[PDB]
């Protein structure tokens, strides 16, 4: 039941306990490096529902990302930038998925769940051997994480006509002149 208790406690963020804990951690993470390793998820329920296991092969990295804009607005989020930086640091791991942890007023903070594809436990266990497959190299760079799908607009409906099934692919398909043999 601890997972629902944590889910509700995370839903209530400006509550006194969560605000106090977030302040102290925000201080601790500013004292720590821009990108550093975590040990244990500070949000175990979020990590678990995103797919973190306590197996030899799963690791957490906390990354600090500067907030704001370029009046130009960057089409990729600060979440995607954090994932890409964590991947460039740990080039030997696959970025499974990232989640928010702190925000302060100058930097947002994100814990990224990463999986080692070369570990024997990961390779033998299904449900993760897909990320052992080679088509999933640098999902964070190709926009294949949750932030990437959200930014690409990969949803079904009449509100996502131009972006679902690939925006550039749709534009090309609409801008090709098809000529047949019998016209």
């Amino acid at each position: 039941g601890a997972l629902k208790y944590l889910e509700e406690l995370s839903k209530k963020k400006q509550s006194d306990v969560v605000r106090f804990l977030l302040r102290v951690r925000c201080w601790e993470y500013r004292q720590l490096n821009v990108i550093h390793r975590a040990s244990r998820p500070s949000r175990p329920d979020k990590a678990r529902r995103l797919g973190y296991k306590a197996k030899q092969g799963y690791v957490i990295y906390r990354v600090r990302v500067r907030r704001g804009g370029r009046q130009l607005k960057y089409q990729r989020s600060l979440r995607a930038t954090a994932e890409e930086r964590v991947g460039r640091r740990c080039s030997n791991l696959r970025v499974l998925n990232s989640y928010w942890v702190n925000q302060d007023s100058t930097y947002k903070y994100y814990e990224v769940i990463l999986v080692d594809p070369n570990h024997k436990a990961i390779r033998r266990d299904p449900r993760i051997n897909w990320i052992c497959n080679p088509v999933h190299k640098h999902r964070e760079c190709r926009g294949l994480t949750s932030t990437g799908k959200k930014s690409r607009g990969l949803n079904k409906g009449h509100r996502f006509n131009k972006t679902r099934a690939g925006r550039r692919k749709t534009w090309k398909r609409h801008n090709t002149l098809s000529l047949w043999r019998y016209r």
Binding site: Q14, D16, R19, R23, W27, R30, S105, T106
Partner: peptide
């Protein structure tokens, strides 16, 4: 959200870090 933040008994380094990064 910045209200009800303690400031009286906190050390100078903590207060300056909070002031610098929580404007």
């Amino acid at each position: 959200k910045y209200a009800f933040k303690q400031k009286e008994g906190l050390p100078d380094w903590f207060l300056e870090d909070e002031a610098k990064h929580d404007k």
